[PDB]
Design a protein around this ligand. Sequence first.
Ligand SMILES: OC[C@H]1O[C@H](O[C@H]2[C@H](O)[C@@H](O)[C@@H](O[C@H]3[C@H](O)[C@@H](O)[C@@H](O[C@H]4[C@H](O)[C@@H](O)[C@@H](O)O[C@@H]4CO)O[C@@H]3CO)O[C@@H]2CO)[C@H](O)[C@@H](O)[C@@H]1O
Ligand SMILES: OC[C@H]1O[C@H](O[C@H]2[C@H](O)[C@@H](O)[C@@H](O[C@H]3[C@H](O)[C@@H](O)[C@@H](O)O[C@@H]3CO)O[C@@H]2CO)[C@H](O)[C@@H](O)[C@@H]1O
Ligand SMILES: OC[C@H]1O[C@@](CO)(O[C@H]2O[C@H](CO)[C@@H](O)[C@H](O)[C@H]2O)[C@@H](O)[C@@H]1O
Length: 628
Amino acid sequence: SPNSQYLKTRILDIYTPEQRAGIEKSEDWRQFSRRMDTHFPKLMNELDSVYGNNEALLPMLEMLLAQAWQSYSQRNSSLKDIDIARENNPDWILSNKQVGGVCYVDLFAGDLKGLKDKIPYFQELGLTYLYLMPLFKCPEGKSDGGYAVSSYRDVNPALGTIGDLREVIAALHEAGISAVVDFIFNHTSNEHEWAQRCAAGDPLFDNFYYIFPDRRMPDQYDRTLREIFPDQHPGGFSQLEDGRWVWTTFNSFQWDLNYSNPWVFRAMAGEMLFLANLGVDILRMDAVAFIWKQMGTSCENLPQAHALIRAFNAVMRIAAPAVFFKSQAIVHPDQVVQYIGQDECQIGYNPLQMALLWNTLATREVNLLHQALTYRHNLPEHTAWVNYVRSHDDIGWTFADEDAAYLGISGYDHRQFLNRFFVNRFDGSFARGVPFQYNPSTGDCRVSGTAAALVGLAQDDPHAVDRIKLLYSIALSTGGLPLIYLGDEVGTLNDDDWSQDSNKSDDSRWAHRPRYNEALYAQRNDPSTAAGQIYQGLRHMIAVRQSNPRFDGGRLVTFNTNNKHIIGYIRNNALLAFGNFSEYPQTVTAHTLQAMPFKAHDLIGGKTVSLNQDLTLQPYQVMWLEIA
Ligand SMILES: OC[C@H]1O[C@H](O[C@H]2[C@H](O)[C@@H](O)[C@@H](O[C@H]3[C@H](O)[C@@H](O)[C@@H](O[C@H]4[C@H](O)[C@@H](O)[C@@H](O)O[C@@H]4CO)O[C@@H]3CO)O[C@@H]2CO)[C@H](O)[C@@H](O)[C@@H]1O
Ligand SMILES: OC[C@H]1O[C@H](O[C@H]2[C@H](O)[C@@H](O)[C@@H](O[C@H]3[C@H](O)[C@@H](O)[C@@H](O)O[C@@H]3CO)O[C@@H]2CO)[C@H](O)[C@@H](O)[C@@H]1O
Ligand SMILES: OC[C@H]1O[C@@](CO)(O[C@H]2O[C@H](CO)[C@@H](O)[C@H](O)[C@H]2O)[C@@H](O)[C@@H]1O
């Protein structure tokens, strides 16, 4: 395997003697060269563990490094300053000062220019991180809400131009907000040029996807493949009009890129560098679990998938240090955490905490949540969870069966309950969600619906507002970067038109992808409305989280409340948080609180509370006690 010093000499071969001498003593090369020596070894190792002795590896690598140099050379000076900062401050993602938001530009602000006008509100809310849903060219009509990419560089016409995007990012950076977008690197739409040329037989795009002549291998593969959208098609393949079959983990119009071909990695790295130079701070690595296939396995979370992501990480450490990765793996908890690492994905969605927040509201029992916060919360250094309550997706019950078993809970039986409960098919349920991808041959089902709809705000449940505040209080204080699904801060309900829109009716997720509700946002400052109650409640928690250093970092120690309905944990040994998931008042006995200070200030209610006496929490009440 070639070394850094060697590959660099060949990178400079494109220059004439006169030019070369000039490049070698330039500041940009000096930085690139230094980063090369520090991170190239990782890049080489990761690529070698995947491609091995593939004859194309070296040629691919050199081509990748050459364009990596050009990319960094072209990279804007301001971004290079952010690179140096991020380099010396890896834990910026762990700061309590960070609070993120996510929205669809079209649904939330109409278009990119319209989004730019929304920045003041984002600052008003306190955001320091803004994630924008798929913004690039995609098939007309059905594109899986933009996740079927037809181009990673041409902005969706309906949203604007690449120019508007560059303006938005700059404006966001001016407002003290990091820009976060998707890097749908596991698949492209079937209309993407690469897909068209590959299927057409263009030798330049040969083996860019997985295409088979018939069902022989697809059938073999399907023996162990999980079905993501069983409603769309069985197994993981879709048939082309010419009779052939292509690997389509998701919708039939989304073709899985073939990373077993090193040229595919190089290509995607090229697209990654493009996004990097737009000034993007964080790339949401979509479906990181599926980027590697192997007959006889689930084709999820395979070793090479982690290796490839770590290779991508190295490229950024070399050509754009400011760019971090956000894992979005919605899989078994043992698998979720493996993607999070300083050299892989620095942050990642915490689906386990999210799913259990909802689980707890339904059962009123914090057992699973407590268990999760006790054994699966803390992460290795320089990494952090992205805690959330809802997102653009359906809710999957990805808690661990093994974990549930230890508690005497049958995973399968429990999901049946959760699913029925949240789709309002369980007596007394306050939830008003809708089913998503019910799978007859497995019994698995997911849930769609906005946070407000799931807590009962649709029927005006008097507990709805407090439920929303309780859930978000957990995501905002457990440790990690909290991501708010914009629209939630004002109690936005499900969309009322999706089911009759022919391009959406077969995907219930659109039920929880409502547009900006002018009426609710106009009430965000009226304490007499649910919108104002929700907004002011969340904003207050946001203000406290960002100003109080006791919430800094991502580590926590759970506190046994001795009340099955109350969750408890401590941040930095100075902040004791209590959360009552019961619709009835619940108590934490004085006996349980004996080791705590006699008195402590509660940042939520702003009152001083005595801990040397029984502490009774009102229904769904949240307390953030400063015990130090
Ligand atoms: O305040 C509202 C209601 O609160 C109480 O009911 C709660 C239970 O206390 C919770 O434990 C939970 O019960 C679920 C349970 O979590 C779920 O697993 C499922 O239980 C199955 C089990 O999985 C299966 O293996 C087999 O044993 O059958 C069990 C029973 O179906 O379903 C339970 C609900 O039926 O949630 C409920 C509802 O919030 C209290 O008891 C109620 O009186 C009260 O209304
Ligand atoms: O953060 C320090 C410490 O926190 C946790 O311990 C607390 C318990 O969770 C909490 O229940 C309480 O313990 C009491 C017992 O429940 C009760 O049976 C009796 O023994 O009185 C105890 C009070 O001394 O308080 C402790 C201390 O805060 C966590 O479990 C520890 O691992 C952690 O070191
Ligand atoms: O229910 C959706 C399904 O897909 C996952 C895979 O991680 O979600 C991401 O990728 C999908 C396909 O590209 C997108 O449709 C989805 O919006 C995106 O979040 C999981 O959430 C789940 O298994």
